[PDB]
Amino acid sequence: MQEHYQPAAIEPAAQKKWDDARISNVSEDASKPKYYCLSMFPYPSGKLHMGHVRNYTIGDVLSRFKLLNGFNVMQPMGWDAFGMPAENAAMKNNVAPAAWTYDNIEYMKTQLKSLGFAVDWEREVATCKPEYYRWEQWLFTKLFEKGIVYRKNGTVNWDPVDQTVLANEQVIDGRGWRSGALIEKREIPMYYFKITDYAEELLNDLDKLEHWPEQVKTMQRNWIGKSRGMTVRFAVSDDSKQGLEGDYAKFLQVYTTRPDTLMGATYVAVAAEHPLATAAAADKPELQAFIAECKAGMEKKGVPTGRYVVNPLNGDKLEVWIANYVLWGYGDGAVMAVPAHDERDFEFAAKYNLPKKQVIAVGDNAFDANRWQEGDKENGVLVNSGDLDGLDFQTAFDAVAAKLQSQGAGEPKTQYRLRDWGISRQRYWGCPIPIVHCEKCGNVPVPADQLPVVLPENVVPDGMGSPLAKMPEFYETSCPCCGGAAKRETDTMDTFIESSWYFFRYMSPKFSDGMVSAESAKYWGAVDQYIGGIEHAIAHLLYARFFTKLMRDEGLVNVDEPFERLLTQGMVVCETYYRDWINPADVVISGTEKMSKSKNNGVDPQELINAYGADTARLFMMFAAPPEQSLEWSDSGVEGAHRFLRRLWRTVYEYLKQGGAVKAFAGNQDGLSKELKDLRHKLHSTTAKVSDDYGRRQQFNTAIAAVMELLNQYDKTDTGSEQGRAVAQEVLEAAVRLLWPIVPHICETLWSELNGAKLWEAGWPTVDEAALVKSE
Ligand X SMILES: CC(C)C[C@H](N)C(=O)OP(=O)(O)OC[C@H]1O[C@@H](n2cnc3c(N)ncnc32)[C@H](O)[C@@H]1O
User: What residues form the annotated binding site for ATP?
Assistant: 597
Give the one entry of Zn ion, ligand X, none that residue 479 binds, where binding means its C-beta sits below a cut-off of 5 to 8 angstroms depending on kind: Zn ion
Instruction: Report in angstroms how near the CB of residue 712 gets to ligand X at its nearest.
Output: 31
80 is a site residue for ligand X (CB under 6 A): yes
Give the one entry of ligand X, Zn ion, none that residue 51 binds, where binding means its C-beta sits below a cut-off of 5 to 8 angstroms depending on kind: ligand X
Give the one entry of ligand X, Zn ion, none that residue 569 binds, where binding means its C-beta sits below a cut-off of 5 to 8 angstroms depending on kind: ligand X
Amino acid identity of residue 342, one-letter, is: D
Sole binder of ligand X in the list 15, 55, 686, 729 (CB under 6 A): 55
Give the one entry of ligand X, Zn ion, none that residue 251 binds, where binding means its C-beta sits below a cut-off of 5 to 8 angstroms depending on kind: none
> Between residues 576 and 717, which has the closer beta carbon with respect to ligand X?
576
Q: Which helix (H) or strand (E) holds 414?
A: strand 410-416
Which residues have CB under 8 Å from 502's CB, separation 6+? 41, 78, 80, 125, 127, 132
Give the one entry of ligand X, Zn ion, none that residue 97 binds, where binding means its C-beta sits below a cut-off of 5 to 8 angstroms depending on kind: none
**Rounded distance, CA 737 to CA 68, Å?**
9
**Rounded distance, CA 607 to CA 112, Å?**
13
**Rounded distance, CA 340 to CA 342, Å?**
6
**Rounded distance, CA 186 to CA 167, Å?**
13
Instruction: Report in angstroms how near the CB of residue 471 gets to Zn ion at its nearest.
Output: 21
> Between residues 300 and 594, which has the closer beta carbon with respect to ligand X?
594
Instruction: Report in angstroms how near the CB of residue 533 gets to ligand X at its nearest.
Output: 2
Binding region: 597
Instruction: Report in angstroms how near the CB of residue 179 gets to ligand X at its nearest.
Output: 15
Instruction: Report in angstroms how near the CB of residue 32 gets to Zn ion at its nearest.
Output: 53
Report DSSP letters for 670-706, one per residue.
TTS-HHHHHHHHHHHHHHHHHHHIIIII--HHHHHHH
> Between residues 107 and 653, which has the closer beta carbon with respect to ligand X?
107
Local structure of 320: helix, strand or coil: strand
652 is a site residue for ligand X (CB under 6 A): no
Q: Rule CB under 5 A: which residues touch Zn ion? A: 438, 440-441, 479, 481-482
- Alpha helices of 569-623 — where are they, by DSSP H? 605-612, 614-623
**Rounded distance, CA 309 to CA 267, Å?**
9
Q: Name which of residues 525 to 544 contact ligand X (CB under 6 A).
A: 532-533, 536, 540
Q: Determine contact, residues 141/448, Cβ cutoff 8 Å.
A: yes
499 is a site residue for ligand X (CB under 6 A): yes
> Between residues 419 and 594, which has the closer beta carbon with respect to ligand X?
594
- Alpha helices of 205-342 — where are they, by DSSP H? 214-224, 247-250, 275-281, 285-296
User: Which residues make beta-bridge pairs with 337?
Assistant: 267
Q: Name which of residues 216 to 275 contact ligand X (CB under 6 A).
A: none
**Rounded distance, CA 399 to CA 495, Å?**
47
Instruction: Report in angstroms how near the CB of residue 544 gets to ligand X at its nearest.
Output: 8
Q: Which helix (H) or strand (E) holds 235?
A: strand 226-236
Sole binder of ligand X in the list 7, 51, 452, 467 (CB under 6 A): 51
Instruction: Report in angstroms how near the CB of residue 560 gets to ligand X at its nearest.
Output: 20
Which residues have CB under 8 Å from 673's CB, separation 6+? 723
Q: Determine contact, residues 136/455, Cβ cutoff 8 Å.
A: no
> Between residues 307 and 599, which has the closer beta carbon with respect to ligand X?
599
Give the one entry of Zn ion, ligand X, none that residue 481 binds, where binding means its C-beta sits below a cut-off of 5 to 8 angstroms depending on kind: Zn ion
Backbone angles phi, psi at 114, to 5 degrees: -60, -25
Backbone angles phi, psi at 187, to 5 degrees: -105, 105
Centroid of chain to Cα 471: 35
> Between residues 333 and 532, which has the closer beta carbon with respect to ligand X?
532
Q: Determine contact, residues 356/349, Cβ cutoff 8 Å.
A: yes
**Rounded distance, CA 763 to CA 773, Å?**
24
> Between residues 498 and 693, which has the closer beta carbon with respect to ligand X?
498
Sole binder of ligand X in the list 334, 572, 619, 727 (CB under 6 A): 572
**Residue 361 DSSP code:** E
User: Which residues make beta-bridge pairs with 436?
Assistant: 444, 488
Give the one entry of ligand X, Zn ion, none that residue 571 binds, where binding means its C-beta sits below a cut-off of 5 to 8 angstroms depending on kind: ligand X
> Between residues 482 and 773, which has the closer beta carbon with respect to Zn ion?
482
Applying CB under 6 A, which part among 47-55, 185-193, 359-367, 617-625 lies near ligand X? 47-55
109 is a site residue for ligand X (CB under 6 A): no
Q: Which of 67, 69, 81 is nearest to 25 (CA)?
A: 67
422 is a site residue for ligand X (CB under 6 A): no
Instruction: Report in angstroms how near the CB of residue 424 gets to ligand X at its nearest.
Output: 19
Instruction: Report in angstroms how near the CB of residue 32 gets to ligand X at its nearest.
Output: 27
**Residue 430 DSSP code:** S
Local structure of 573: helix, strand or coil: strand
706 is a site residue for ligand X (CB under 6 A): no
562 is a site residue for ligand X (CB under 6 A): no
Instruction: Report in angstroms how near the CB of residue 496 gets to ligand X at its nearest.
Output: 6
683 is a site residue for ligand X (CB under 6 A): no
624 is a site residue for ligand X (CB under 6 A): no
Binding-site ranges for ligand X (CB under 6 A): 40-43, 51-52, 54-55, 80, 499, 532-533, 536, 540, 569, 571-572, 594-596
